[PDB]
Design a binder for these strands. Sequence first.
RNA 1: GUCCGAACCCACUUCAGUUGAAAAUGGAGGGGAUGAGUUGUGGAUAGGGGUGAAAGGCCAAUCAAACACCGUGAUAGCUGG
RNA 2: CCCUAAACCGACACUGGUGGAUAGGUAGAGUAUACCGAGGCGAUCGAGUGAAUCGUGGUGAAGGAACUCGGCAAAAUGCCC
RNA 3: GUAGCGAAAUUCCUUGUCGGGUAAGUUCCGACCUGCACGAAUGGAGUAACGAUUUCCCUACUGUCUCCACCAUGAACUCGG
RNA 4: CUCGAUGUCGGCUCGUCGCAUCCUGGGGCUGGAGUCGGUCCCAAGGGUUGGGCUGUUCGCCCAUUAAAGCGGCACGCGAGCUGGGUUCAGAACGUCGUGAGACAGUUCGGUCCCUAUCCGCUGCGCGCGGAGGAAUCUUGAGAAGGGCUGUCUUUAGUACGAGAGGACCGAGACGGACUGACCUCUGGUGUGCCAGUUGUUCUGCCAAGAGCAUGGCUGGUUGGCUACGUCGGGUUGUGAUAACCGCUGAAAGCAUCUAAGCGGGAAGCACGCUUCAAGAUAAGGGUUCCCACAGGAGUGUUCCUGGUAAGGUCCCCGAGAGAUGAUCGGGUUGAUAGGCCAGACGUGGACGCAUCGUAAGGUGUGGAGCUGACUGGUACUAAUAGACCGAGGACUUUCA
Lengths: 62, 122, 120, 114, 214
Amino acid sequence: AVPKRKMSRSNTRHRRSQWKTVATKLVTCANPACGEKHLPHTACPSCGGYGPRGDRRQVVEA
Amino acid sequence: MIQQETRLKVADNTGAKELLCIRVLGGSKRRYAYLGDTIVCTVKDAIPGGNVKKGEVVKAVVVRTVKSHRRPDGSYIKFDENAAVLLKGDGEPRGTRIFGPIARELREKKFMRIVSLAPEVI
Amino acid sequence: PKPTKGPRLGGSPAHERIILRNLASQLFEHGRVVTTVTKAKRVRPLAEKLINRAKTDTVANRRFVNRTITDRGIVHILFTEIGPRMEGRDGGYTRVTRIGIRKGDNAPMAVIEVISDKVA
Amino acid sequence: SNIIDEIDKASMRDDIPEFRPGDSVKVHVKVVEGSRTRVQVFSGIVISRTGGGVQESFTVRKLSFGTGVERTFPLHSPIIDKIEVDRHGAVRRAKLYYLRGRRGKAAKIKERGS
Amino acid sequence: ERTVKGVLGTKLGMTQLWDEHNRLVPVTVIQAGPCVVTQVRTPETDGYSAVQLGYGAVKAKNVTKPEAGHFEKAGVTPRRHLVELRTADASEYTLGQEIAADVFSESDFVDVTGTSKGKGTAGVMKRHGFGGLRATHGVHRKHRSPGSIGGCSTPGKVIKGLRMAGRMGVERVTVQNLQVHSVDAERGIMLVRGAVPGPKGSLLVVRSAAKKAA
RNA sequence: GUCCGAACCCACUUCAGUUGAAAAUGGAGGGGAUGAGUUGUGGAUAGGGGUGAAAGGCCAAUCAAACACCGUGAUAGCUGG
RNA sequence: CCCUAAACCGACACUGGUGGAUAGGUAGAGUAUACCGAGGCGAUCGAGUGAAUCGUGGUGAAGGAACUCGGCAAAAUGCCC
RNA sequence: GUAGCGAAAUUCCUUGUCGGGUAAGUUCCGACCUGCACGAAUGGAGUAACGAUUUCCCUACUGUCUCCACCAUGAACUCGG
RNA sequence: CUCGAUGUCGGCUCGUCGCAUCCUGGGGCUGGAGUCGGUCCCAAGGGUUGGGCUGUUCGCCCAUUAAAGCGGCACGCGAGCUGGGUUCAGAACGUCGUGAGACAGUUCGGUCCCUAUCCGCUGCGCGCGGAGGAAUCUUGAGAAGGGCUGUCUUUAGUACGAGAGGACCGAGACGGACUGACCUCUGGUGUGCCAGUUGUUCUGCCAAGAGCAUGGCUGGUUGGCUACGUCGGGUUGUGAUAACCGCUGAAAGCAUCUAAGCGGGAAGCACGCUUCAAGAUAAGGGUUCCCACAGGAGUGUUCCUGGUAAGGUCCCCGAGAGAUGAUCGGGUUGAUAGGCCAGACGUGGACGCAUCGUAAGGUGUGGAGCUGACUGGUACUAAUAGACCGAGGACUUUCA
Ligand SMILES: [Mg+2]
Ligand SMILES: [Mg+2]
Ligand SMILES: [Mg+2]
Ligand SMILES: [Mg+2]
Ligand SMILES: [Mg+2]
Ligand SMILES: [Mg+2]
Ligand SMILES: [Mg+2]
Ligand SMILES: [Mg+2]
Ligand SMILES: [Mg+2]
Ligand SMILES: [Mg+2]
Ligand SMILES: [Mg+2]
Ligand SMILES: [Mg+2]
Ligand SMILES: [Mg+2]
Ligand SMILES: [Mg+2]
Ligand SMILES: [Mg+2]
Ligand SMILES: [Mg+2]
Ligand SMILES: [Mg+2]
Ligand SMILES: [Mg+2]
Ligand SMILES: [Mg+2]
Ligand SMILES: [Mg+2]
Ligand SMILES: [Mg+2]
Ligand SMILES: [Mg+2]
Ligand SMILES: [Mg+2]
Ligand SMILES: [Mg+2]
Ligand SMILES: [Mg+2]
Ligand SMILES: [Mg+2]
Ligand SMILES: [Mg+2]
Ligand SMILES: [Mg+2]
Ligand SMILES: [Mg+2]
Ligand SMILES: [Mg+2]
Ligand SMILES: [Mg+2]
Ligand SMILES: [Mg+2]
Ligand SMILES: [Mg+2]
Ligand SMILES: [Mg+2]
Ligand SMILES: [Mg+2]
Ligand SMILES: [Mg+2]
Ligand SMILES: [Mg+2]
Ligand SMILES: [Mg+2]
Ligand SMILES: [Mg+2]
Ligand SMILES: [Mg+2]
Ligand SMILES: [Mg+2]
Ligand SMILES: [Mg+2]
Ligand SMILES: [Mg+2]
Ligand SMILES: [Mg+2]
Ligand SMILES: [Mg+2]
Ligand SMILES: [Mg+2]
Ligand SMILES: [Mg+2]
Ligand SMILES: [Mg+2]
Ligand SMILES: [Mg+2]
Ligand SMILES: [Mg+2]
Ligand SMILES: [Mg+2]
Ligand SMILES: [Mg+2]
Ligand SMILES: [Mg+2]
Ligand SMILES: [Mg+2]
Ligand SMILES: [Mg+2]
Ligand SMILES: [Mg+2]
Ligand SMILES: [Mg+2]
Ligand SMILES: [Mg+2]
Ligand SMILES: [Mg+2]
Ligand SMILES: [Mg+2]
Ligand SMILES: [Mg+2]
Ligand SMILES: [Mg+2]
Ligand SMILES: [Mg+2]
Ligand SMILES: [Mg+2]
Ligand SMILES: [Mg+2]
Ligand SMILES: [Mg+2]
Ligand SMILES: [Mg+2]
Ligand SMILES: [Mg+2]
Ligand SMILES: [Mg+2]
Ligand SMILES: [Mg+2]
Ligand SMILES: [Mg+2]
Ligand SMILES: [Mg+2]
Ligand SMILES: [Mg+2]
Ligand SMILES: [Mg+2]
Ligand SMILES: [Mg+2]
Ligand SMILES: [Zn+2]
């Protein structure tokens, strides 16, 4: 099949506006010495650590 | 399960050796015949000395299916060859002898003569 | 252990078997490995099965582990270091932690690592 | 759950002898004949045991009048009066389905401890 | 308008029994557990007669304040589920009353209602029994096609209600006239002769048979 | 100008492709496979002509008369503007 | 320097076409096929996910051409003595 | 219009008629001749062997079908380019 | 009307509609002994088979069936399939033509494509609204599905009939087809599990194994999915009616089913059964929870910002869910998954050792070892840590 007619501006924009992305949320690193933003349930790219203020196990050597 | 074009062997001594199911009696659109079901058959092969000729349309009752048969008590019965027994149009065998084992489902108040002539009812 | 339900890694179940076995071998070789989320979570059960089998050291057990792995050096590592490291552990010999994503294809990445500290 | 199993224990029996596929077995099956009832013996070879609690069932193959007849019995069925073991076979398979296409000397089973 | 007895339970699975005619009967095992009357609906205040039953084990940290207040007014401990039974004898039910599987005897016919197992997006050949096309004889990439879906310039449209592919399963299904095999109330177990909708662990509503029996 | 069967040559059936991987192919089978075989290099035949185990086939990816340029801004009671 | 090609002929870094030479081991009659050697590659978007559906393979109770324009496709058969 | 052949790759009527095959055969095969409109090098009638030719039958064999189910995959589907 | 293209036969698939009804339901007249029939009405709820021949439609035939209805929808349906027929180029036969060629004569052979924009339709979400914000359970305006039928037994050899023959109205049992759910049973599957085994390469070798050859090939096989499987379903009924049968009864001193009125009367109509359903913007109802925040402008406060309550989402572990969204469960106050431990299922006797045999191998130790989904335990691993959204006494009017 082929598009019979050129789609109107209103309809094209109605469909196109739904092509979007949500913002990444980010969470503050539990390490007091780092305090950076990292993905939830993900090792902090700055400190390379994971876990609550206590645990704090190293995950990434960075 | 016996359907149209299924070829069966004969447990009678009528001289017929092989039947071809032309129809399964019991209602329209019915697919299969099981132990104790009546079918319309044609005689594909018969003994030269006998009272049944090849190409004759007869009625038979199915005994000794290969597929399986469930029973209300949860057991199953299974044979190794699809067999059938010809009838005289009134529920009685055409032959005077029955060959091989016969299913118990024939003794559901219906085929008393066949069960009586059965060498073994399993 | 349990099969993978969905489509297999590497475009073929045979290749998935190879991938999981090699990935477990590399995990045992290096202690830790960064191997994306799905591969790590799929290799965890096999790796823990192997470690549990290696927790008790017999010749028959070593041959059974060598059925997998197939690098006797890694078998020696598993039966000498990793095995005795988990004398008191009742399972859970490995852990998986997410790292981020790959820039090239947005693969969610994670590191799976054998437990290092002694339970006692 | 184990609730299913404890319910099944009410239906399971205890007088089942120990046997394997490959063993010769006589099953004393109860047959209803109108007002009458009878005990008919089905003698044959156990070719399969599909296990599991009260769902356990076993298949017996008999050679009668040049035709093979296979009967599948739930091991805890109340229609079975009892089970007798004649021979203990020496087989290598859990399911003896190959015996379906074998007759004569090729269809006979070695005895246990031979 | 009809007087219905009812109880709530969980599908534990199936097994098999032998009845007194030595017949093998498939039985579904329903943990027809204790249900409590959380709320009674009357024509004066609600406009119809029905009894709301509870049933279910719930964690104290997973019950919210509105639910906790509802159960506190009912005077009972919180339950996970809440299902109503449209009965014309709702009045005879007092708030917080105890209901157990022994509400059904050894040979009552019942109707069992549950949500069927899901199948995802199913094809026409599966969710409607469509006979597709042949496997050979030149069939061109349409072996499981739905065939035609209408006529021509008249009506130049697809009629409403045509059966096509879609998501099948996860829906309210009531299976009727199942004869209860046994009830053991001291542990809340019901053995019902038949197969009931839903996966193991689903919620089931067991009501008196609407059509009484066969 | 035997037989079976790879390479090689072919193109019978089927499926896929059919804005293709490909302006004719791919997968699975299939015919010939010491012969009227197949193939490399160079050469010869040219447009009312060539060549053709002959289908109007082929003659530089559309041949009941190639292509290019010229007569030429051919002509068209026809269609469009 | 490429050269049974990503460098040539195909508009492409194109599942096509392209003449010749060398061409080991085991199973095998074999240059078929399977796994390997000398040697060379991992293929030029990926990561996931049990949707329908299409393509490509696999298996199947009982029946066995009732399919269909037609046994189309598939299955069976298959080698040596 | 002879030999020979004929409802034929030719027969309109036509599913001619009879016979065989099938439980049922507008096709088939053997006959009849009433050859619309066979016929003797545009050859007549036959013919072992040969045929990816056309047609009918038997057997074996099977997802062709009764009646589909399930498995794995390249697309489809979600995310990044 | 369409030639700057409206693809032309039959089958397949999917239906939908009409009734000029094939079956099943009801009724008149005949009748007709009964049994059956045939005919004029009602009635479209459901059902209406499989094959042989032919490209066929048609038609004939075989075997059934309660019956094998007739028609419309571009002679429904080729951006759904089929290409056998038709209607291209090849060739042959007959006939016609001097010939090139022709033939609603025949014969063999013979290319199509389309990633769906709009409406339509099957599903599934996001948003906003439902005059505060929420959580749960609901009413049903309205919508959809479902509606088939046989045989036998009994009434009863009763009624009827000269006999032979053989009922109505009821009662019971067992089926076919269709269909919903489902996996306990049976069957199938099986890229997991166990086992055997061929070729070959490899782990130095023995021993024990690994890769590849379709999972190399075979024998099995739990879970899941499924039908060929097992459970259930159609109904028992209610109301108003069709044809029709009536009661009372005139106009018309009688009569008349009708003019006043009342009653019977079908699988059809509407309910009964099942399912969806308040976007039913008419946005419903019950029960429960949270609460009169803060700061600005302001012009009756208005309205815009900001932090919250009840509550919810994101994120993570999952499956009873699933294309993705969604749905449901769990998230340390925790059994959600994996692992671990035990069991069951499955396979069928591991390695090692002993012993027997020249050897391939046999026996024992030992229902061994291995082992997924199923079951029960167990925080060992991961469900860290956190953010974000979300009312304000909630517009106005009148009542009480
Ligand atoms: Mg729009
Ligand atoms: Mg699976
Ligand atoms: Mg991929
Ligand atoms: Mg492989
Ligand atoms: Mg077992
Ligand atoms: Mg099909
Ligand atoms: Mg195909
Ligand atoms: Mg329109
Ligand atoms: Mg030759
Ligand atoms: Mg070449
Ligand atoms: Mg060709
Ligand atoms: Mg094609
Ligand atoms: Mg040849
Ligand atoms: Mg030259
Ligand atoms: Mg020509
Ligand atoms: Mg050319
Ligand atoms: Mg010219
Ligand atoms: Mg001029
Ligand atoms: Mg001009
Ligand atoms: Mg014009
Ligand atoms: Mg080279
Ligand atoms: Mg190339
Ligand atoms: Mg180039
Ligand atoms: Mg050799
Ligand atoms: Mg090769
Ligand atoms: Mg090398
Ligand atoms: Mg190279
Ligand atoms: Mg490239
Ligand atoms: Mg997916
Ligand atoms: Mg196959
Ligand atoms: Mg198998
Ligand atoms: Mg099969
Ligand atoms: Mg078979
Ligand atoms: Mg056969
Ligand atoms: Mg046919
Ligand atoms: Mg047909
Ligand atoms: Mg073929
Ligand atoms: Mg083949
Ligand atoms: Mg003829
Ligand atoms: Mg003709
Ligand atoms: Mg004839
Ligand atoms: Mg002459
Ligand atoms: Mg001549
Ligand atoms: Mg001539
Ligand atoms: Mg000639
Ligand atoms: Mg000749
Ligand atoms: Mg000849
Ligand atoms: Mg040829
Ligand atoms: Mg045949
Ligand atoms: Mg893909
Ligand atoms: Mg993309
Ligand atoms: Mg146009
Ligand atoms: Mg009418
Ligand atoms: Mg109809
Ligand atoms: Mg109607
Ligand atoms: Mg006709
Ligand atoms: Mg119609
Ligand atoms: Mg048409
Ligand atoms: Mg169309
Ligand atoms: Mg054609
Ligand atoms: Mg055509
Ligand atoms: Mg001739
Ligand atoms: Mg002439
Ligand atoms: Mg043709
Ligand atoms: Mg499409
Ligand atoms: Mg309603
Ligand atoms: Mg509406
Ligand atoms: Mg199970
Ligand atoms: Mg099985
Ligand atoms: Mg290798
Ligand atoms: Mg093979
Ligand atoms: Mg299973
Ligand atoms: Mg009167
Ligand atoms: Mg009157
Ligand atoms: Mg041993
Ligand atoms: Zn940090």
